[PDB]
Amino acid sequence: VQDALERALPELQQALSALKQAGGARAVGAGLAEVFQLVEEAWLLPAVGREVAQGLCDAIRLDGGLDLLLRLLQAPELETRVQAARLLEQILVAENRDRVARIGLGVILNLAKEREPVELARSVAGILEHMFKHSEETCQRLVAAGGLDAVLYWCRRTDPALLRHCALALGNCALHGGQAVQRRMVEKRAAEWLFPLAFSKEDELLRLHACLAVAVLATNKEVEREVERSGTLALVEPLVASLDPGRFARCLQGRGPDDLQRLVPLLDSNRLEAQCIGAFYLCAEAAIKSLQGKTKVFSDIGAIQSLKRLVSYSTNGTKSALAKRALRLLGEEVPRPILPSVPSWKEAEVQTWLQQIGFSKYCESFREQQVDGDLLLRLTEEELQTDLGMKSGITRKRFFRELTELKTFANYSTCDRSNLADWLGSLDPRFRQYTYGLVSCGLDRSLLHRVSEQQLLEDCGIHLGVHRARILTAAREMLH
Amino acid sequence: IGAIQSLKRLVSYSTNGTKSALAKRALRLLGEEVPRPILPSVPSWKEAEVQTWLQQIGFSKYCESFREQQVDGDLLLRLTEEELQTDLGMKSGITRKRFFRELTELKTFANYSTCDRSNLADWLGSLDPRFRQYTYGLVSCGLDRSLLHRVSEQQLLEDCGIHLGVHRARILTAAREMLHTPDVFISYRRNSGSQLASLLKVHLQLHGFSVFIDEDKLIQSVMGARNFVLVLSPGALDKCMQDHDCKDWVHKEIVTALSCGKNIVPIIDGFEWPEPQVLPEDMQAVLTFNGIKWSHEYQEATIEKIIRFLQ
Ligand SMILES: NC(=O)c1ccc[n+]([C@@H]2O[C@H](COP(=O)([O-])OP(=O)(O)OC[C@H]3O[C@@H](n4cnc5c(N)ncnc54)[C@H](O)[C@@H]3O)[C@@H](O)[C@H]2O)c1
């Protein structure tokens, strides 16, 4: 355990003393090459070299060699510049990134302007890649300055190793950026430069990380229009449909829970490409964490219930197959897809729908009351509070959120005559939940010009007055 | 005095690295734990982020009050007086008001990227920085910038939940006073012509040209296209030689482009010109066009040369 640390500390002590003492033209570069080869020996140890490399990076930081590397990045010689950059690339760990964000911002940013040689760019792309993972302030300082333009210019090259760093840099800048960083990327059209990275048939990891960056940028609701106009979403769904997560899980050692929490809101952002990317990556990393004995992280975060919602509300075969495989590689059961004809439900479909979304406490609350799909669509506050024993209003509000998700994904073919659900969906996709509110009252397209607000409140049961005003306005302005 | 909780608020609500590092060092030199920075995507919260946010601001008594009720970030942003009083056991109105002060501090520092389409939070922040807390009040009701001229005070009170009438009057006033067939088709080779065709498509869509990429589907793509760009990779006419049956896709696209008579612009990347006598008779006319050599280091002038040679 402590063997590699005791073998690797005094060698780096001698090497950093040779770097600090000698100031020659080529002996300093030879010392940088010695430190870089010892770093390559450090990272390539099976299940040992992680903590060993972390301790050696801590020793390089506490010795003072990080400021030495930041001084040698300003050297006029090109050779020691590229060796110092390739040495600084492999040591950007979470304790070194704070020190680089304190001082090294502006030195690496200066080398972001020099873009012509490949030996600089292949390492400076990875340095900017790992510096996008620090915080939102560093992402703002890199995007507002010429740090994003270096990656957007280096996406033009044909180097298969450099474009991986560019795709990972844009993905990590989209993950840890926020609102304004994504605005400054997409207004500068960062999603359009990911098109040669998501289509190039040279590598298979590179297209996956490019589609990851596209899918993370495709979750901001002020952004998705220019992403759909970019045309990079259409390369996402077949690429996920043509690969296997087990082979890429064997190819990649996973990621920590702080990065596992970044893939979870990709599934609840109701976009098909983002759900496919999130299901693929969580299936591969669930295979990784199920090879080991740490499968409780997905239950600590809560991605398992989101995968159950992906299975039970699926309209695509690829994301449903990936979510079923991800739930099969874990230690719980897979759910069945629900029957979409909700007014055609009997009691057992209601019981299954309760068992698939996490309402197993109230199942016997609905069996004694004989609630079918016709009574489930016509359920209010008072019947939940009094008749069903659901006393808590927070539990009732969670039930109404799940009822919103159910009444969005429903088949109203047995009741709707004038296709009123598409009329509600053409205005706002959160209006189709009131379809049963208006069909059961006897309405169709030829009556909504004689409906008032009181008829929508009392009979149709539309509790939000903004939705009542929008439905009355759009019923009185464009139906006759 | 009480400066330790203010340092915890500085750590948990930090937008600067220097003050966060100094507050973490100040809490490390004392005898208590340092908190973690919260996840700004509040509607993307699960239960554990809500529990951590409770543990970092001094609501450790009610943590088991939220775990049994399963309150996530969507329920935390939509919480009122009555659900705090009845369902959560927070009987004291002073404790509820301290919780609403902390909820004000939370809904000021939040990421609404997954719900806000028209950037309504910046519209609320341009008036008064204490208005962005009502962003979730207006996004969840279905509103954006193009609807606020038809909102009343009752819709802000009941649905949006704006309890202060001064803020309702200011939002209504400021909402009513200041709110109111492709062109270039690219043929390429599957082996080594994908990256060059993708790069040409990107550099032509940077200038506003509708470019299509990738017999019942491609003929209507060529007929609707105004121009034609032929990517000549090394080996781009390898499968087109001795193809006397019209089965190759690139051969069909070249025959269709010659039948259309469009402005065929070849793009050469290390590919010599083939002989006319080895090609079939339906594709010998492609060798008489003005091809363009491709440079991998001076691409801007090359794309400008392509624009000068297209309609
Ligand atoms: N082969 C290589 O050359 C190699 C490999 C890895 C890292 N590096 C270098 O390391 C630096 C970046 O590494 P990083 O650590 O900052 O990455 P990171 O913090 O951005 O990603 C998290 C990594 O740490 C691990 N991890 C963190 N917490 C964990 C936990 N609680 N349980 C299990 N695993 C956990 C994950 O497996 C994941 O690999 C860069 O300089 C990079 O060049 C090099």
DSSP string, A299-357: HHHTHHHHHHHHHHT-S-HHHHHHHHHHHHHTTSPPPPPPPS-GGG--HHHHHHHHHHH
Partners of A473 on chain B (C-beta within 8 Å) are 150
Distance in angstroms (rounded) separating the CA atoms of residues B195 and B190:
10
φ, ψ of residue B184 in degrees (nearest 5): -125, 120
Q: Which amino acid is at A417?
A: R
Known catalytic residue: B304? no
Query: Are residues B303 and B311 in contact, defined by beta-carbon separation less than 8 angstroms?
Result: no
The DSSP letter of residue A155 is T
Measured from CB, residues less than 6 Å from any atom of ligand 1 are: A 43, 89-94, 130, 133, 253-257, 259
Distance in angstroms (rounded) separating the CA atoms of residues B307 and B190:
25
Ramachandran area for residue B84 (φ above 0: left; ψ -120 to 50: alpha; else beta): alpha
The DSSP letter of residue A434 is G
Distance in angstroms (rounded) separating the CA atoms of residues A137 and A177:
8
Q: Which amino acid is at A163?
A: L
- To test the pocket of ligand 1, the residue of A40, A50, A92 to mutate (highest count of ligand atoms within 8 Å of its CB) is A92
CA of A299 to the centre of ligand 1 (A): 22
The DSSP letter of residue A387 is I
H-state helical runs in A409-464: 420-427, 435-439, 453-458
Distance of CA B118 to the CA centre of its chain: 13
Query: Are residues B21 and A98 in contact, defined by beta-carbon separation less than 8 angstroms?
Result: yes
Query: Are residues B53 and B37 in contact, defined by beta-carbon separation less than 8 angstroms?
Result: no
Query: Are residues B44 and A274 in contact, defined by beta-carbon separation less than 8 angstroms?
Result: no
Instruction: List CB contacts of B308: < 8 A, sequence separation 6 or more.
Output: none
Distance in angstroms (rounded) separating the CA atoms of residues A156 and B200:
11
Distances, alpha carbon B84 to alpha carbons A383, A398, B93, in Å? 22, 15, 9
Nearest CA among A466, A262, A339, A77 for reference residue B40: A262
Inter-chain touch B154–A465, beta carbons under 8 Å? yes
Q: Which amino acid is at B113?
A: S
Inter-chain touch B48–A220, beta carbons under 8 Å? no
Partners of B158 on chain A (C-beta within 8 Å) are 465
Q: CB distance from A259 to chain B under 8 Å? A: no
CA of A92 to the centre of ligand 1 (A): 9
Which of A192, A221, A300 minimises the CB distance to B202? A192
Distance of CA B154 to the CA centre of its chain: 34
Query: Are residues A103 and A131 in contact, defined by beta-carbon separation less than 8 angstroms?
Result: no
**Degrees (nearest 5) of the Cα angle A314, A317, A321?**
90
Q: Which two tokens stand for residue A391?
A: 């006393």
Kindly compute the dihedral angle of the four CA atoms of residues A385, A386, A390, A392, in this order, to the nearest 10 degrees: 50
CB atoms closer than 10 angstroms to residue B129: 10
Distances, alpha carbon A26 to alpha carbons A124, A190, A237, B53, B289, in Å? 21, 40, 51, 53, 53
Structural determination approach? cryo-EM
Which residue matches tokens 């607000």? A453
Q: After which residues is chain A broken (C to N over 2.5 A)?
A: 252
Query: Are residues B160 and B141 in contact, defined by beta-carbon separation less than 8 angstroms?
Result: yes
Task: Give the best residue of A131, A187, A197, A221 to mutate against chain B (max B CB count within 10 A).
Answer: A221
Nearest CA among A312, A314, A305, A247 for reference residue A276: A314
CA of A139 to the centre of ligand 1 (A): 19
Q: Can you spell out the DSSP letters for chain B?
A: --HHHHHHHHHHT-S-HHHHHHHHHHHHHTTSPPPPPPPS-GGG--HHHHHHHHHHHT-TTSHHHHHTTT--HHHHTT--HHIIIIIS----HHHHHHHHHHHHHHHHS---TTT-SS-HHHHHHHH-TTSGGGHHHHHTTT--TTTGGG--HHHHHHTS----HHHHHHHHHHHHHS----SEEEE--TTT-HHHHHHHHHHHHTTT--EE---TTTHHHHHH-SEEEEEE-TTTTSTTTT-TT---HHHHHHHHHHHHT--EEEEESS-PPPPTTSS-TTSGGGGGS--EE--SS-HHHHHHHHHHT--
Q: Which amino acid is at A478?
A: M
Q: Which helix (H) or strand (E) holds A277?
A: helix A272-291
Instruction: List CB contacts of B78: < 8 A, sequence separation 6 or more.
Output: A397, B136, B140
Query: Are residues B226 and B184 in contact, defined by beta-carbon separation less than 8 angstroms?
Result: yes
Nearest C-alpha in B relative to A263: B44
Distance in angstroms (rounded) separating the CA atoms of residues B32 and B54:
17
Distance in angstroms (rounded) separating the CA atoms of residues B125 and A317:
43
Distance in angstroms (rounded) separating the CA atoms of residues A190 and B77:
32
Taking CA atoms only, the protein residue closest to ligand 1 atom 13 is A93
- Residues linked to residue B228 through DSSP beta bridges, in sequence order: B185, B264
Nearest CA among B270, B260, B263, B307 for reference residue B189: B270
Q: Confirm whether residue A25 is marked as ligand binding.
A: no
Distance in angstroms (rounded) separating the CA atoms of residues A197 and A200:
6
Query: Are residues B70 and B47 in contact, defined by beta-carbon separation less than 8 angstroms?
Result: yes
Q: Which two tokens stand for residue A280?
A: 């693929």
Buried/exposed A240-252: b ≥16 CB within 10 Å, e otherwise: beeeebeebbeee
Distance in angstroms (rounded) separating the CA atoms of residues B128 and A33:
56
Kindly compute the dihedral angle of the four CA atoms of residues A464, A469, A475, A476, in this order, to the nearest 10 degrees: 160
3-state class (DSSP) for residue A462: coil
Taking CA atoms only, the protein residue closest to ligand 1 atom 16 is A93
Q: Confirm whether residue A93 is marked as ligand binding.
A: yes
Residue length of chain B = 311
CB atoms closer than 10 angstroms to residue A105: 17
3-state class (DSSP) for residue A287: helix
Query: Are residues A216 and A175 in contact, defined by beta-carbon separation less than 8 angstroms?
Result: yes
Q: Can you spell out the DSSP letters for A81-110?
A: HHHHHHHHHTT--TTHHHHIIIIITTTHHH
Distance in angstroms (rounded) separating the CA atoms of residues B247 and B242:
11
Nearest CA among B181, B175, B277, B294 for reference residue B234: B294
Instruction: List CB contacts of A439: < 8 A, sequence separation 6 or more.
Output: A412, A415, A416, A420
Task: Give the best residue of A103, A466, A472 to mutate against chain B (max B CB count within 10 A).
Answer: A466
Q: CB distance from A398 to chain B under 8 Å? A: yes
3-state class (DSSP) for residue A224: helix
Chain B residues 149-188 within an 8 A CB cutoff of chain A: 150-152, 154-155, 158-160
Count residue pairs from A and B with Cβ separation < 8 A: 125
Distance in angstroms (rounded) separating the CA atoms of residues A167 and A277:
15
Q: Which two tokens stand for residue A392?
A: 């808590």
Q: Which two tokens stand for residue B245?
A: 């049956």
Nearest C-alpha in A relative to B38: A258
Percent helix, strand, coil in chain A (nearest 5)? 65, 0, 35
Which of A269, A393, A470 minimises the CB distance to B83? A393
Distances, alpha carbon A242 to alpha carbons A201, A245, A286, A310, B190, in Å? 13, 10, 19, 20, 17
Which residue matches tokens 């966060």? B20
Q: CB distance from B118 to chain A under 8 Å? A: yes
- How close does chain B come to A194, measured CA to CA in Å? 9
Inter-chain touch A265–B117, beta carbons under 8 Å? no
Distance in angstroms (rounded) separating the CA atoms of residues A333 and A352:
13
Q: Can you spell out the DSSP letters for A178-203?
A: -HHHHHHHHHTTTTTTTHHHHH-SS-
Q: Which two tokens stand for residue A209?
A: 């990380």
Inter-chain touch B142–A470, beta carbons under 8 Å? yes
Which of B41, B199, B297 minimises the CB distance to A265? B41
- How close does chain A come to B16, measured CA to CA in Å? 7
**Resolution in angstroms for this experimental structure?**
3.0
- How close does chain A come to B25, measured CA to CA in Å? 14
Q: Which two tokens stand for residue A228?
A: 């759909």
Task: Give the best residue of B70, B199, B300 to mutate against chain A (max A CB count within 10 A).
Answer: B199
The DSSP letter of residue A246 is H
Taking CA atoms only, the protein residue closest to ligand 1 atom 44 is A90
CB atoms closer than 10 angstroms to residue B270: 10
Inter-chain touch A465–B74, beta carbons under 8 Å? no
